């Protein structure tokens, strides 16, 4: 954490020097804003696309390197397996998704930057193609998974419009400042939301948790919203979602300032939902946003397997049990720019170059395993589609291993998971051929990896008998509703070792000692 905070300044300087159009004041200097609750204004931003500008700068640097011939880029291909030689990660096996060709690549070091695994749940704010194939394969090869149960949610997201959509647009957290979260008292109301009298609205989160001031933490609000929607008092087309009314805020304040502060959000909502937020109340539903878990790494960003470095969102890194706002991009840029080169140079200097080609037996074994897996998946040709299995797994995970977790629910999910995996492996239907642009095969592989990973993450959630950060246990909560920690027994990092059995992974404890910031 201290290293990241120390290199953040160099991150900002390098980003500025590359031509990233950060917001500037009238005098020509940079501008800063508070991130909706932070006590200081330490955030540098573009208008609404800071991540896009940062990625564009990084991609421009990468393109410059490619033009120089130093870096070779392979788009539209995905890593399918990792080849370890003499205990060192010495290559990968990939598949070109355009022609279906299987290729073997050998190198001295392998770095994984495949992002988080938040797409294990069917509904999430992550992209459609986000997956966890690479990290799961690395963990199977011998890498240790660090705290897989640590997941971060987001309070404000657009709810689904039926049983076909698996993407939830991420609203900003600048909303809910007026509170006004409510649900109609009657379970089924055909009247317009604005036609409902203020006395006829079950304004939950107002009569409950009144000391906070209708500004409760996102965890409690999201759990209450999920409980309300599961009880049958939903307001969306599919019964999922809660009402966030802005009529009182509009009446109290001036429309011009509310417009100047929420114009982009209102326009995007009207483009997506089709209803003007000024008149009709918003509909929101929390969704999973980030995964603090990942492959365990040391101070050198190196996993358990020598020669394998995990950076970005794919490692546990230093986010603990809750990721602060505007920190994931900073961590990724720190790992890419000012951290990985030193450690990778040290590791490469400790060894000698070359010595391994793609003709080694390990590469052939990995290629044969990948080919057999692909052939089996293509030859199952059952009845149910891949999307149905993914939706079932996501619904089960969100219901049991979601925001509210209890021992009975986790045990039920752990019992249910192998049956779902067997049904997927026995009754799945993917069309097409291996040597074609078949997206169904990629989706099936990602679904299989998600099914394998869900059992491990549920086991980790069950093992941790305390509430901390995103991981919340109902048996270890304060009477107010917050999370209660147990620093006497669970003040460590849990790394899970793949023992060959998906239900019996070995547990390793890395103790955490605090010398400068004491727990409180």
């Amino acid at each position: 954490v201290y290293r990241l905070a120390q290199v953040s300044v160099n991150i900002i300087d390098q980003c500025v020097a590359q031509g990233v159009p950060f917001a500037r004041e009238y005098g020509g200097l940079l501008d800063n804003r508070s991130f909706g609750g932070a006590q200081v204004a330490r955030t540098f931003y573009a208008r609404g696309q800071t991540g896009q500008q940062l990625l564009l700068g990084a991609y421009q640097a990468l393109s410059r390197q490619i033009a120089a011939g130093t870096v070779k880029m392979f788009p539209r291909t995905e890593m399918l397996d990792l080849v370890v030689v003499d205990g060192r990660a010495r290559g990968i096996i990939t598949r070109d998704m355009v022609t279906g060709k299987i290729t073997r690549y050998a190198a001295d070091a392998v770095v994984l930057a495949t992002g988080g695994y938040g797409n294990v749940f069917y509904l999430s704010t992550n992209a459609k193609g986000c997956n966890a194939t690479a990290i799961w394969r690395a963990h199977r090869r011998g890498a240790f998974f660090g705290n897989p149960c640590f997941t971060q949610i987001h309070p404000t997201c657009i709810p689904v419009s039926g049983e076909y959509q698996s993407k939830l647009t991420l609203m900003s957290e600048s909303l809910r400042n007026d509170g006004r979260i409510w649900v109609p008292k009657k379970k089924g109301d055909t009247r317009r939301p604005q036609d409902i009298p203020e006395s006829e609205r079950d304004y939950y989160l107002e009569e409950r948790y009144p000391s906070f001031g209708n500004l409760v933490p996102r965890d409690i609000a999201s759990r209450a919203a999920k409980q309300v929607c599961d009880e049958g008092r939903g307001v969306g087309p599919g019964g999922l979602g809660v009402y966030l009314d802005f009529a009182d805020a509009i009446k109290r304040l001036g429309r011009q300032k509310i417009a100047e502060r929420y114009g982009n959000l209102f326009d995007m909502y009207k483009q997506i939902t089709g209803e003007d937020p000024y008149e009709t109340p918003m509909r929101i539903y929390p969704a999973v946003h980030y995964t603090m878990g990942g492959l365990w790494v040391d101070y050198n960003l190196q996993s358990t397997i020598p020669g394998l470095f995990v950076i970005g969102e794919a490692n546990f890194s230093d986010h603990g049990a809750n990721r602060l706002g505007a920190s994931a991009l900073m961590q990724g840029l720190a790992d890419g720019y000012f951290i990985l080169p030193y450690t990778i140079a040290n590791f490469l200097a400790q060894v000698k170059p070359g010595g391994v080609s793609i003709d080694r037996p390990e590469f052939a074994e990995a290629e044969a395993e990948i080919n057999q897996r692909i052939q089996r998946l293509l030859s199952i040709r059952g009845k149910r589609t891949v999307d149905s299995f993914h939706r079932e797994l996501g619904k089960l995970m969100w219901d049991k291993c979601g925001m509210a977790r209890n021992a009975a629910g986790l045990r039920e999910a752990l019992q249910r998971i192998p049956e779902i995996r067997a049904e997927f492996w026995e009754n799945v239907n993917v069309p097409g051929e291996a040597n074609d642009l078949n997206q169904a095969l990629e989706k099936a592989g990602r679904v299989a990896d998600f099914l394998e990973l869900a059992e491990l993450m549920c086991l980790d959630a069950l093992h941790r008998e305390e509430s901390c950060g995103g991981h919340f246990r109902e048996e270890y909560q304060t009477p107010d509703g917050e999370a209660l920690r147990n620093d006497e027994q669970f003040s460590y990092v849990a790394a899970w070792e793949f023992t060959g059995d998906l239900a019996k992974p070995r547990l390793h404890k890395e103790p955490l000692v605090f010398e400068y910031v004491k727990p409180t």
Binding site: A17, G28, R64, P75
Partner: protein, 257 residues
């Protein structure tokens, strides 16, 4: 809402393609076009036919993966939006909707609606950057940038690289994309030392990639998802003229691997 669709279907790059008609009866007005295509693909898989392949990553109109020509206008009839942002409430019951990918020499067709857009990457690789290294950066507040210049640069830089400008322009030119990149990089002081070379290189790369010339028709800005205005083309033209006055010679083209 019953909808008839005419989807372009092509097996591979060299196999000729053709239009196929698919009729679906129940279409939710509030669901997006891509969700409708996903439902159609699921129905085809249930029936046993080959699903339609298309590009989609973000479903938010930021990544630029979406690429579809709907009813002859890129990114659907509505303007200032991407294909993923288009919803079925903008259409009429019983309408016939034609779906087909971009058509250009520099954008080879790989599947029914999937095209290759590596030409934009090669254009970017031809000097479309700032040649700075890691760790040598000065302090952020060293060089002041006026708010107007920063706003114009941010307006020009918000290009998702969807390629709709190439497919909409009757000449099939990439002038809008190159102009936007050049305007974004040339409005900041950090891009000053190498702008006059950069544009020329970029322009040459476009001419090498197979894109057409520009007739100043203006069709490119009409369908651009992020409303990149036509002043970027004027800025690029001014930069090219000034570079030609200085005797700037284009470098060797970027040959694809």
């Amino acid at each position: 809402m019953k909808i008839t669709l005419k989807i372009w279907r092509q097996k591979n790059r060299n196999t000729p393609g053709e239009f196929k008609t698919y009729v679906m009866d129940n279409v939710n007005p509030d669901m997006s076009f891509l969700e409708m295509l996903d439902v159609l693909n699921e129905d085809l898989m249930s029936r046993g036919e080959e699903p339609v392949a298309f590009d989609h990553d973000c479903r938010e109109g930021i990544c630029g993966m979406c690429s579809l020509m709907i009813n002859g206008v890129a990114h659907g009839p509505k303007n200032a939006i991407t294909t993923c942002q288009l919803h079925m409430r903008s259409f009429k019951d019983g309408d016939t909707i034609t779906v087909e990918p971009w058509r250009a020499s520099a954008f080879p067709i790989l599947k029914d609606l999937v095209v290759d857009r590596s030409a934009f990457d090669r254009i970017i690789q031809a000097g479309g950057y700032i040649s700075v290294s890691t760790g040598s950066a000065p302090d952020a507040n060293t060089i002041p940038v006026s708010k107007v210049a920063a706003d114009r640069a941010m307006d020009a830089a918000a290009c998702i690289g969807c390629g709709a400008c190439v497919a909409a322009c009757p000449n099939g030119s990439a002038m809008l994309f190159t102009a936007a990149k050049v305007t974004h990089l040339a409005l900041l002081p950090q891009g000053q030392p190498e702008r006059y070379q950069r544009v020329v290189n970029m322009v040459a790369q476009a001419d090498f990639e197979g894109f057409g010339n520009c007739t100043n028709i203006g069709e490119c800005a009409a369908v651009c998802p992020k409303e990149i205005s036509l002043e970027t083309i004027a800025q690029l033209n001014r930069d090219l003229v000034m570079a030609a006055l200085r005797g700037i010679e284009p470098n060797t083209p970027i040959v694809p691997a």
